[PDB]
Amino acid sequence: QPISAFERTLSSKRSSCEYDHFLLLVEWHHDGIVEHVPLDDHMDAQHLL
Amino acid sequence: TSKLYMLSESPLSTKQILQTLHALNMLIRIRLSLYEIIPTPFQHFTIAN
Amino acid sequence: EYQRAIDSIEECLNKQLRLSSEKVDQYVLIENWTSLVGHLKTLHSLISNYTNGRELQNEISSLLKQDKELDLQIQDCMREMTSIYDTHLPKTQKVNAETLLDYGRKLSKFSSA
Amino acid sequence: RTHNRQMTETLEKYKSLDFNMEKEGDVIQQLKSS
Amino acid sequence: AELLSQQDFSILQSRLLEFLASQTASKELTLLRQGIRQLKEKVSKMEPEEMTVKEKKSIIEILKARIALKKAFLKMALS
Prior knowledge:
Radius of gyration of chain D: 15 Å
Shape of chain C: rod-shaped
Number of strands of chain D: 0
Number of helices of chain C: 3
Distance between the termini of chain D: 44 Å
Structural class of chain C: mainly alpha
Number of strands of chain C: 0
Helix content of chain D: over 70%
Largest sheet of chain D: none
Structural class of chain D: mainly alpha
Helix content of chain C: over 70%
Oligomer: part of a larger assembly
Strand content of chain D: under 5%
Shape of chain D: elongated
Order of helices and strands of chain D: HH
Largest sheet of chain C: none
Distance between the termini of chain C: 92 Å
């Protein structure tokens, strides 16, 4: 996930944005389309399906 | 070669090693307060035992 | 969106010149004007927006500088307390001179070239 | 000796001794609020 | 002579008015066209440079909260 321009400005010293950081995410494919689906941290795979 | 193969006397003062620990923890506080880079998710830390 | 508003202003102007040259019809012309006036109002609200956001952002730079300075002040105070308390690791018989001196003089020939 | 005097004086300058500091942290939060 | 301020907007509007009141060829219109040219080049030199103006306000306020807490803590140790 790219850093927010505003996150970067706020970040300073101990709170640092400079850490390379990323999330886990899903996008379900559909004939001719792609949609990003929010992923609950407590999501059974069955529940997602 | 002495210093690499040297080995200390086998007694370790357990009161000493506590005081090492105190000075060590204390020294990580020193470091961390003036350690340049903390990631923001790490901003809360405990200097343990 | 700036260039779109301004281009629209230009266009309204040239269309107005075109209208006046051809013939006078009150409606067409006054509607042209008031469309141009609307686009001018959107242009203005937008530029006052930009100057506002910019002056706010300069305020941000001054305030960020203030935060950095305060961080450096807490830095300095902790630095000085930890300097004063110098932190050291813990440390990892008496002699009679006679036996000492005799031993050293023995050793003198043997540690010497 | 010099180190110990320096330590006593730096300790006296900053002295704000306390226990159960959580109460003082939240007291400081509502102080900052006002 | 370049800065993208409100004053040069009001310059534009005054040029427009003066054109309208002036009305084959026009010396007031050509001045107007110089003006819109200038503003066009001022917007072409323009750079987007955008972070959210709402976010801008919010970070002004939480940063100011930071600063006030900083001074509070500092003066706390000095006492």
